[PDB]
Design an enzyme around this catalytic site. Structure first.
Site, PDB file in Angstrom:
ATOM      1  N   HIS A  14       0.784  -1.227   0.000  1.00  0.00           N
ATOM      2  CA  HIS A  14       0.000   0.000   0.000  1.00  0.00           C
ATOM      3  C   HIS A  14       0.822   1.287   0.000  1.00  0.00           C
ATOM      4  CE1 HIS A  14       0.594  -1.470   4.097  1.00  0.00           C
ATOM      5  NE2 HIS A  14       0.598  -0.208   4.485  1.00  0.00           N
ATOM      6  N   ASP A  50      -0.204  -8.580   5.288  1.00  0.00           N
ATOM      7  CA  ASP A  50      -0.069  -9.974   4.885  1.00  0.00           C
ATOM      8  C   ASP A  50      -1.337 -10.803   4.708  1.00  0.00           C
ATOM      9  OD1 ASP A  50      -0.657  -9.690   7.514  1.00  0.00           O
ATOM     10  OD2 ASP A  50       0.745 -11.188   8.266  1.00  0.00           O
ATOM     11  N   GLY A  88       4.788  14.000   7.394  1.00  0.00           N
ATOM     12  CA  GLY A  88       4.376  13.067   6.366  1.00  0.00           C
ATOM     13  C   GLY A  88       3.702  11.836   6.928  1.00  0.00           C
ATOM     14  N   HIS A 109      -3.588   0.515  20.574  1.00  0.00           N
ATOM     15  CA  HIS A 109      -2.215   0.030  20.572  1.00  0.00           C
ATOM     16  C   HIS A 109      -1.332   0.788  19.581  1.00  0.00           C
ATOM     17  CE1 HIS A 109       1.020  -2.966  20.881  1.00  0.00           C
ATOM     18  NE2 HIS A 109       1.158  -2.772  19.581  1.00  0.00           N
ATOM     19  N   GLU A 110      -1.752   0.809  18.320  1.00  0.00           N
ATOM     20  CA  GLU A 110      -0.999   1.491  17.277  1.00  0.00           C
ATOM     21  C   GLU A 110      -0.800   2.975  17.558  1.00  0.00           C
ATOM     22  OE1 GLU A 110       0.746   0.201  15.124  1.00  0.00           O
ATOM     23  OE2 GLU A 110       0.013  -1.856  15.387  1.00  0.00           O
ATOM     24  N   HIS A 170       2.246   3.755  19.273  1.00  0.00           N
ATOM     25  CA  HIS A 170       3.401   3.913  18.388  1.00  0.00           C
ATOM     26  C   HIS A 170       3.340   5.262  17.679  1.00  0.00           C
ATOM     27  CE1 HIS A 170       4.638  -0.102  19.133  1.00  0.00           C
ATOM     28  NE2 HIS A 170       3.670  -0.678  18.444  1.00  0.00           N
ATOM     29  N   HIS A 184       7.239  -1.180  22.322  1.00  0.00           N
ATOM     30  CA  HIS A 184       6.559  -2.287  22.976  1.00  0.00           C
ATOM     31  C   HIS A 184       6.969  -2.443  24.433  1.00  0.00           C
ATOM     32  CE1 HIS A 184       5.655  -4.448  18.918  1.00  0.00           C
ATOM     33  NE2 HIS A 184       4.628  -3.717  19.315  1.00  0.00           N
TER      34      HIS A 184
HETATM   35  C1  FIN Z   1      -5.284  -4.753  24.305  1.00  0.00           C
HETATM   36  O1  FIN Z   1      -3.862  -4.860  24.142  1.00  0.00           O
HETATM   37  C2  FIN Z   1      -3.244  -4.997  22.825  1.00  0.00           C
HETATM   38  C3  FIN Z   1      -3.992  -4.701  21.595  1.00  0.00           C
HETATM   39  C4  FIN Z   1      -3.335  -4.857  20.274  1.00  0.00           C
HETATM   40  C5  FIN Z   1      -1.945  -5.299  20.192  1.00  0.00           C
HETATM   41  C6  FIN Z   1      -1.292  -5.482  18.853  1.00  0.00           C
HETATM   42  C7  FIN Z   1      -0.096  -6.357  18.724  1.00  0.00           C
HETATM   43  C8  FIN Z   1       0.526  -6.564  17.437  1.00  0.00           C
HETATM   44  C9  FIN Z   1      -0.015  -5.928  16.257  1.00  0.00           C
HETATM   45  S1  FIN Z   1       0.730  -6.210  14.690  1.00  0.00           S
HETATM   46  O2  FIN Z   1      -0.349  -6.141  13.749  1.00  0.00           O
HETATM   47  O3  FIN Z   1       1.384  -7.496  14.793  1.00  0.00           O
HETATM   48  N1  FIN Z   1       1.876  -5.113  14.250  1.00  0.00           N
HETATM   49  C10 FIN Z   1       3.148  -5.122  14.731  1.00  0.00           C
HETATM   50  C11 FIN Z   1       4.133  -5.315  13.526  1.00  0.00           C
HETATM   51  C12 FIN Z   1       4.067  -6.674  12.910  1.00  0.00           C
HETATM   52  C13 FIN Z   1       3.996  -4.309  12.362  1.00  0.00           C
HETATM   53  P1  FIN Z   1       3.393  -3.582  15.508  1.00  0.00           P
HETATM   54  O4  FIN Z   1       2.730  -2.496  14.730  1.00  0.00           O
HETATM   55  O5  FIN Z   1       2.790  -3.676  16.786  1.00  0.00           O
HETATM   56  O6  FIN Z   1       4.868  -3.265  15.635  1.00  0.00           O
HETATM   57  C14 FIN Z   1      -1.202  -5.037  16.365  1.00  0.00           C
HETATM   58  C15 FIN Z   1      -1.831  -4.819  17.656  1.00  0.00           C
HETATM   59  C16 FIN Z   1      -1.208  -5.589  21.426  1.00  0.00           C
HETATM   60  C17 FIN Z   1      -1.865  -5.434  22.740  1.00  0.00           C
HETATM   61 CA    CA Z   2      -3.047  -9.298   8.267  1.00  0.00          CA
HETATM   62 CA    CA Z   3       1.304  11.936   9.714  1.00  0.00          CA
HETATM   63 ZN    ZN Z   4       1.390   0.914   6.003  1.00  0.00          ZN
HETATM   64 ZN    ZN Z   5       2.971  -2.647  18.471  1.00  0.00          ZN
END
Ligand code: FIN
Ligand code: CA
Ligand code: CA
Ligand code: ZN
Ligand code: ZN
Length: 163
Positions: A68, A75, A90, A118-119, A122, A128
């Site tokens: 994207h 994936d 950006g 969660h995101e 970040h 994490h």
């Molecule tokens: C209620 O508590 C939580 C809710 C969501 C996640 C979570 C964990 C992993 C992902 S991920 O899609 O695996 N992305 C990871 C990476 C593979 C890109 P990241 O964005 O966390 O680094 C997304 C949400 C963790 C804890």
């Molecule tokens: Ca996926």
């Molecule tokens: Ca932005």
């Molecule tokens: Zn992206």
């Molecule tokens: Zn994360």
């Protein structure tokens, strides 16, 4: 528990914009999940989130599939649910959600409110946490979204960055 380089927003009033939506939820439910997820962080910090309906916001939210335009492709069903970029210009701060997921606003996999919450961590500069009871734990695990509140470890993390 703070992103490498400790990057963060130079301002507390940040705008966000939901660019598109997922067929898995109504547009309003997505907005609700997103607005509520931002609120989780706002109650534990000076950050104020202002939604705009068009144009570029500080934090753009979108649902994408596979490749994207940013190299970190999704994936397909399950696996990677989303990802976001650390504070910056950006794409920085932006949050992308895999459009091929069975998004939900209930406990069923996968609750958009929780993943977004969660995101956004970040998007705000949080890394994490190794605390399984932390929102920023590396792995998703639904949690009662009813009276759900930001876990203390995440409060500590967000506080450590913005007070
Ligand atoms: C209620 O508590 C939580 C809710 C969501 C996640 C979570 C964990 C992993 C992902 S991920 O899609 O695996 N992305 C990871 C990476 C593979 C890109 P990241 O964005 O966390 O680094 C997304 C949400 C963790 C804890
Ligand atoms: Ca996926
Ligand atoms: Ca932005
Ligand atoms: Zn992206
Ligand atoms: Zn994360």
């Amino acid at each position: 528990m703070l992103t490498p380089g400790n990057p963060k927003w130079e301002r507390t009033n940040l705008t966000y914009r939901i660019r598109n939506y997922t067929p898995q939820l109504s547009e309003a439910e997505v907005e609700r999940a997103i607005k509520d997820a931002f609120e989780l962080w706002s109650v534990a910090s000076p950050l104020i989130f202002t939604r705009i309906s068009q144009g570029e916001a500080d934090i753009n939210i979108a649902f994408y599939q596979r490749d994207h335009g940013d190299n970190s492709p999704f994936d397909g069903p399950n696996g990677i649910l989303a990802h976001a970029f650390q504070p910056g210009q950006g794409i920085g701060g932006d949050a992308h959600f895999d459009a091929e997921e069975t998004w939900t606003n209930t406990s069923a996999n996968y609750n958009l409110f929780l993943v977004a919450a969660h995101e956004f961590g970040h998007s705000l500069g949080l890394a994490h946490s190794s605390d399984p009871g932390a929102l920023m734990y590396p792995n998703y695990a639904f949690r009662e979204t009813s009276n759900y509140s930001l876990p203390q470890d995440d409060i500590d993390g967000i506080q450590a960055i913005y007070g």
